[PDB]
């Protein structure tokens, strides 16, 4: 049972890494340099 639990923890770590890579892809697709303020004549 102990080794089964450790194996499932390892799988959970893999899943978390996959999810963070996918959201890295999404924020790669996003594009902005606004910094909450464009120059006042733009």
């Amino acid at each position: 049972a102990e080794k089964e639990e450790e194996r499932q923890e390892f799988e959970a770590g893999l899943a978390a890494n996959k999810a963070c890579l996918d959201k890295i892809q999404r924020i790669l697709s996003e594009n902005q340099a606004l910094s909450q303020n464009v120059h006042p004549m733009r």
Partner: protein, 59 residues
């Protein structure tokens, strides 16, 4: 006149920087305009023996 050339520029957006992130004083300005934290109160504080406060010691 050459001096008139200094201000002969119509505004067009590509003479302007890519981003614009200035210093915003919205909070510390108020905290300046008002007085800072300070207490002129009367002496208030419980008596404490630290390690144990108020046991039930008895014979």
């Amino acid at each position: 006149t050459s001096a008139s050339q200094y201000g002969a520029f119509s505004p067009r957006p590509f003479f302007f920087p890519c981003k614009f992130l200035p210093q915003e004083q919205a909070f510390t300005e108020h905290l300046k305009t008002t007085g800072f934290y300070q207490n002129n109160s009367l002496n208030v504080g419980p008596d404490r023996t630290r390690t144990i406060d108020s046991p039930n010691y008895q014979h």
